[PDB]
Design a protein around this ligand. Sequence first.
Ligand SMILES: [Ca+2]
Ligand SMILES: [Ca+2]
Length: 185
Amino acid sequence: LLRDEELEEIKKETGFSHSQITRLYSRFTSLDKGENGTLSREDFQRIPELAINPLGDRIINAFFSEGEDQVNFRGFMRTLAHFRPIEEPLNSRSNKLHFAFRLYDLDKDDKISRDELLQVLRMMVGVNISDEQLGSIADRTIQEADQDGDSAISFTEFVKVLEKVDVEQKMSIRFLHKLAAALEH
Ligand SMILES: [Ca+2]
Ligand SMILES: [Ca+2]
């Protein structure tokens, strides 16, 4: 059972209401198959909405900090705070875009390489996008973001290229809004 001081601190750290947090704890609780107060990666497969998504494994893996194979409710709620609709909080443009950047930056060297970009594109596009056109999408996308000529995208570049775009209305970002709502509801 979630203690009230725990609930008040989450509320302040994350921006979820008392009510939202209570609902998410119950979802946390139903997902905890080992009844040990934490979730493993495999536990996240019982969120089929997440798991079936093309970036599912990546989104899930992102709940786990380096070295750790179990996430607690606090860790869980902190990650979800990145997914909240805007309305520096954890759902700020920067924090939210950093979560997204992290989906692409598989080796965590803080740059998206051409290959890393290709791997996400291959996961997301439809049946009729050719390997050739994949190369051109990856190259143009790098071209548009790259301002220091390393042919890789840094976080600043990733953010810059979206500086005057409404991130909040992007489909992938709206997935995250939807996910957080469905976990709660
Ligand atoms: Ca990288
Ligand atoms: Ca660059």
